[PDB]
Amino acid sequence: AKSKNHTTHNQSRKWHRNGIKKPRSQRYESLKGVDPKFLRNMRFAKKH
Amino acid sequence: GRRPARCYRYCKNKPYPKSRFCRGVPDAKIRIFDLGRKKAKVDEFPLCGHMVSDEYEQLSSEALEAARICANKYMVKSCGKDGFHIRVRLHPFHVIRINKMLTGMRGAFGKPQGTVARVHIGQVIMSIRTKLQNKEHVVEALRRAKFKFPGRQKIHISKKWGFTKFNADEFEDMVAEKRLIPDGCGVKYIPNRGPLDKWRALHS
Amino acid sequence: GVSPKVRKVLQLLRLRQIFNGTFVKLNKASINMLRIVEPYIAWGYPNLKSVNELIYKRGYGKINKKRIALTDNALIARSLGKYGIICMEDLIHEIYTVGKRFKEANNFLWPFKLSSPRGGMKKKTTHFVEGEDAGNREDQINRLIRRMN
Amino acid sequence: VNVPKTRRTFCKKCGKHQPHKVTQYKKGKDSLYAQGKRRYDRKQSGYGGQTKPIFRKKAKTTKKIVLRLECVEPNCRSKRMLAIKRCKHFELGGDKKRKGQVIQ
Amino acid sequence: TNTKGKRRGTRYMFSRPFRKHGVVPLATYMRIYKKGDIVDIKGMGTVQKGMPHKCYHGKTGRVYNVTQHAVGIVVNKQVKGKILAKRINVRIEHIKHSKSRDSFLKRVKENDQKKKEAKEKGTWVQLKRQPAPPREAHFVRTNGKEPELLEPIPYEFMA
RNA sequence: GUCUACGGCCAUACCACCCUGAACGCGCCCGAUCUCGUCUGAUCUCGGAAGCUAAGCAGGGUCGGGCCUGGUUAGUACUUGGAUGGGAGACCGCCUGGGAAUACCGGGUGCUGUAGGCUU
RNA sequence: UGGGGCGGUACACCUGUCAAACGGUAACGCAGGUGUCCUAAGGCGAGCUCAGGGAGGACAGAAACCUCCCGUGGAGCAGAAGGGCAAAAGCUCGCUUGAUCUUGAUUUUCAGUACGAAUACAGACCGUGAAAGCGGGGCCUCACGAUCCUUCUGACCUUUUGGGUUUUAAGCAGGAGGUGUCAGAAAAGUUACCACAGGGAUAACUGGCUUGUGGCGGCCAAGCGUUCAUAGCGACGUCGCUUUUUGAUCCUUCGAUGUCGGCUCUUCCUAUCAUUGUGAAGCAGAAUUCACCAAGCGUUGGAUUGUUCACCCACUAAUAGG
RNA sequence: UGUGAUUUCUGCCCAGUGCUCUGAAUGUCAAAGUGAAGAAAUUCAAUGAAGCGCGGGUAAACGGCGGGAGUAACUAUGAC
RNA sequence: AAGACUAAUCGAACCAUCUAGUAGCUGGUUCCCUCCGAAGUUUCCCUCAGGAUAGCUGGCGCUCUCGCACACGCAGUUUUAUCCGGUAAAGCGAAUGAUUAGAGGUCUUGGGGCCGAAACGAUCUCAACCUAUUCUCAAACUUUAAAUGGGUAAGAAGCCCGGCUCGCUGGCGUGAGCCGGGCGUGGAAUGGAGUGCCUAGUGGGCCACUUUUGGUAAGCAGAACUGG
Ligand SMILES: [Mg+2]
Ligand SMILES: [Mg+2]
Ligand SMILES: [Mg+2]
Ligand SMILES: [Mg+2]
Ligand SMILES: [Mg+2]
Ligand SMILES: [Mg+2]
Ligand SMILES: [Mg+2]
Ligand SMILES: [Mg+2]
Ligand SMILES: [Mg+2]
Ligand SMILES: [Mg+2]
Ligand SMILES: [Mg+2]
Ligand SMILES: [Mg+2]
Ligand SMILES: [Mg+2]
Ligand SMILES: [Mg+2]
Ligand SMILES: [Mg+2]
Ligand SMILES: [Mg+2]
Ligand SMILES: [Mg+2]
Ligand SMILES: [Mg+2]
Ligand SMILES: [Mg+2]
Ligand SMILES: [Mg+2]
Ligand SMILES: [Mg+2]
Ligand SMILES: [Mg+2]
Ligand SMILES: [Mg+2]
Ligand SMILES: [Mg+2]
Ligand SMILES: [Mg+2]
Ligand SMILES: [Mg+2]
Ligand SMILES: [Mg+2]
Ligand SMILES: [Mg+2]
Ligand SMILES: [Mg+2]
Ligand SMILES: [Mg+2]
Ligand SMILES: [Mg+2]
Ligand SMILES: [Mg+2]
Ligand SMILES: [Mg+2]
Ligand SMILES: [Mg+2]
Ligand SMILES: [Mg+2]
Ligand SMILES: [Zn+2]
């Protein structure tokens, strides 16, 4: 009892059938991952 | 032990030559690639006649040797033992695998039985070098040889001088002017760029 | 039995069905597109009479996302007179002489729905050098229009 | 491998580097009054046989080494557990790997 | 079946070109990478620290962070239909500014000027690119000579 | 015209061998008390200024080797898309578009930024 | 799992290629490797040059040791391969222990989850350096493992049940004890006395595609034939047909196509054993050998053996093949 | 429990496995019991049955019962 | 002693109940019209005749906007600029590796030997060997180097002017953030976009051009591209 083992045959039809949507960009992106020592001063500047 | 050659005629698989990855193969049946008075200067044997291919296929070492011998025999019997020089311009670098079924179809990867040579269209297989009064004998020799190969080949005379790469009409003037030197079975072209001490040695 | 890249380029040119037709202006951008869908079309360099016969007979408008016939000039002017186009001839001028306001005049028009060639075609699967119909058949396009219309 | 018997590393009590002494870690007894074995007894008591699995199929041939550090400073006497990659042979404070010499 | 190593299939990419091995010419380091800049990526394999993955070799991105020796970059990636955005930290010697916007910048500045000056004139002149148009009816001179005459040639079995 | 210190681009700047080098420089060069290190003041460190272009460096030369760049090779090899085209097959030709590399033949042989000297 | 069993591990991992110039991409596809090793082979600083080749020097020789010149890496850097490195990442010396303590973010495989491995930052304590600086393991790419349970370390840490004190036990946070069928059950055989649900998703006959092997036949012609390439044979080479041999495959058939051989009976084919009509010889005659038209009529009796095949006796125009 | 009238015979092996004998004189070897420490649960120590090991006997008990080389006045064989 | 007989039943009789025992497996599943309309692929499982996970599909909506004299946003598309790659072909008088033949080298080790006491007196040669040339090769070699391809950019989330805050950094200064003003078409051709819940059936595949691996080949086995 042997079988198929891998295929990427039909898939591009499936992908484009709903589309390939680039991400939704915005202004005022998020500050997740930046340097702590720089982020800190931003607070103090806005705090005064 | 040997098969026919319809099983291995077409250029199907990629090259699989003899190297550190492929080991365990015998040698080839041909070992000599040129015959006749192979020392003659460029002036004695100016005429060249070739055998040319017309297919993209594979030729075996056995075929080359058989062809080599048939031509030598007649060419001797016609002209002489030293009226010519013959050269073969192919080498058997590609290898052939065999799967021997004494499991079935499991673990299929053959053993290196054989060697063979590949051909492109326009390539050259055989060439002869001799004099002009022996033209038709040269043609007759090669014609006996085509019956040893699997395909359709054809014959032509070259405009060149011998096994060189210069046109005959130009060669003879061009050696009497110190551009071409007869250094052996060939020549040596020299341009007007080097250092003059080689222009001093010549012209003296 | 058509390819995705080619299915795209046709439906930009609004050719979503057999024996439809549209005008178009020519530049490096357009011409390369036509090389891509060469085997499926047949194009040419038309004259004035063909522009007349198309628009009057088989020529309709796009209005409110509907398809409405050009019977009177009220329709044209009301939708298209801000460009200085108030009648049929003003289009034909704007089309035949590719004007400044071509885009709007053409996109006002619905793609022409034509009938099959009276008399027959030679062989649609080949180019118009090998006895076929495809590719560019520059001035002979008009000979064909006489028989589709 | 080889490891010397001392070093200087961080004491998480004193807040500094201080010298330590070194010895290998072994494993202790089982104490017989933990909630694990008490359960396993109340369950394994009676008729029924064996109740919880047993392990039989081994693969490993080594063990990760574990060290035990002790601050020499009195009035700290803090200890830690430190770890090393795997090894088949181990040794505390052997030779010094002399270079340039002859081997007989 | 293939493996999952991080450098499978990089014999040539993470390989220095011909007669350019050696130390690094260090105007690479002295460049200035501020926030919002558009950047392309190219893994130098002469130094191994901070180099990105295969999938980002040849991609272009945008800065969001700045460290002492590296940069943070926002890069898109197509993986099974949906596209994702990704934040890879990368060291300097694997990057380079991109000239893929300087053309735009030459225009807007020339275009601002060319509007403001030559505004008093009154004409709204061209300001926006147009494609290559058709090609300008014109004459051709035969300054005397009749043209040459070509024809084909006979075949020859030259080899 | 040119040098010194620091450099960027890293052979149009490299390799071999020959000619010339005014002034300022750069070096060779003379010693080892103290500084310093050597099996050995050869290298490295220090204190010096009798003599010298021999060398290094600078420029220049070679029907020079290499390097940079053109041409030819060649609209060749190969190649996207197409056909109820050929052919026993292997493979070939055509329509629509793109388009290389050797051999061979020519030319060139360091550009410069900052600070400071000589060239009265 | 090219039916299953025996064999192997393609069952968790690494390099190159196949793979069609982003990435990704299969088969019991090719070639190879792993379950380790290191108090330095980790980390800082300084100084120097490798492989080999040439010419010389008391014993000295192909090779001990000394010196000079050339030397773009042609040597080494623990291991498989691949990349990368010259006043280094290599060789040698001096000092040391960033192979330490602690949060969170990202990448890789991927569902965009975990393990593992890796990267760039921040806070501490430190080491080396004149200082810039570098270092939180091995130049990079692989070297490893959940809950439940047990053991150890830590805080003058919470709870132990109506309150208080001491011991024990339970808790919190971090390491280790291990699962190789490597996202993780605790596990030997036989059945010809056997049984059930299913299967043509899968084998033992026919049929079908292929024709390696088996059989039959052409091409050219070095030699045989005393002489004489071709009366008759024919090396080394090469082009083909057939399905009366055995294989490869697994399309139909598992709610059933009755599985060897002899007896019996009919028809058909030709790749002609003989008989009719002819040609050719190394055809004197008689016997024999090659070939052409041709499938009309014939091709037997018996010992042995289950025999298909084999083998011997006897007669016959002949004792041919399917 | 095994062989299977009569006649004539029943060969060697106690290493393996089973069975069997003794045995305080030797390791190991449970509950209860004995004693020391602790505030008490508890811990520690000494003690120590059969059995397993130490040692003997048994094959009409399961069963098992080998290779190389040289060698005889012609060769070949091969008592040695 | 044959696993034979025990009421036509025996490698564990028959009767009732537990009992509608369990079944990842076979067979069956009851009227119409309209509308939309698939997969046979990823990762994990003592997983391979099966489940979970994502993908493919439907339904229910909601926020916006337009030929409403009135706009932004999108895209298996082309263009203009700009980066990435090491496959076809080519190359070996360029590196690694393989290989043929003769000219100038007894380079040079020795000779079935060689004219000879033999030597490098000669003279050859051979396994290799210096110099300049020569015939043929590479899936796991390469200086060179395509065609088709992949990623960015093409403006209001932009440009400019002026001023404020900062334990961050510091020759003086940079950088980031906040405030207040001035300036609208920014290449082609197309069309209405966005966002959120519930959710089924599937999870055995097959063929053709072109590229392509094993095999003598296959209506054979395994893959990439598009279409059926
Ligand atoms: Mg499947
Ligand atoms: Mg193949
Ligand atoms: Mg009619
Ligand atoms: Mg017709
Ligand atoms: Mg078609
Ligand atoms: Mg009990
Ligand atoms: Mg590749
Ligand atoms: Mg001195
Ligand atoms: Mg000088
Ligand atoms: Mg001089
Ligand atoms: Mg030159
Ligand atoms: Mg199985
Ligand atoms: Mg590809
Ligand atoms: Mg150093
Ligand atoms: Mg190191
Ligand atoms: Mg730190
Ligand atoms: Mg209580
Ligand atoms: Mg209490
Ligand atoms: Mg039996
Ligand atoms: Mg055969
Ligand atoms: Mg079958
Ligand atoms: Mg089947
Ligand atoms: Mg199948
Ligand atoms: Mg029946
Ligand atoms: Mg029947
Ligand atoms: Mg016949
Ligand atoms: Mg007995
Ligand atoms: Mg007996
Ligand atoms: Mg015994
Ligand atoms: Mg029985
Ligand atoms: Mg039921
Ligand atoms: Mg089923
Ligand atoms: Mg199942
Ligand atoms: Mg190639
Ligand atoms: Mg679903
Ligand atoms: Zn301490």
TrEMBL record, chain D:
Keywords: Metal-binding, Ribonucleoprotein, Ribosomal protein, Zinc. Zn(2+) binds at residues 11, 71, 73, 76. One of its GO terms (biological process) is translation. One of its GO terms (cellular component) is cytosol. The keyword Transmembrane helix does not apply. GO terms for molecular function: structural constituent of ribosome. Residues 33-54 are annotated as: Disordered. Belongs to the eukaryotic ribosomal protein eL42 family. This is LOW QUALITY PROTEIN: 60S ribosomal protein L36a. It comes from Mus caroli. The chain holds residues 38 to 141 of 142 of the full protein.
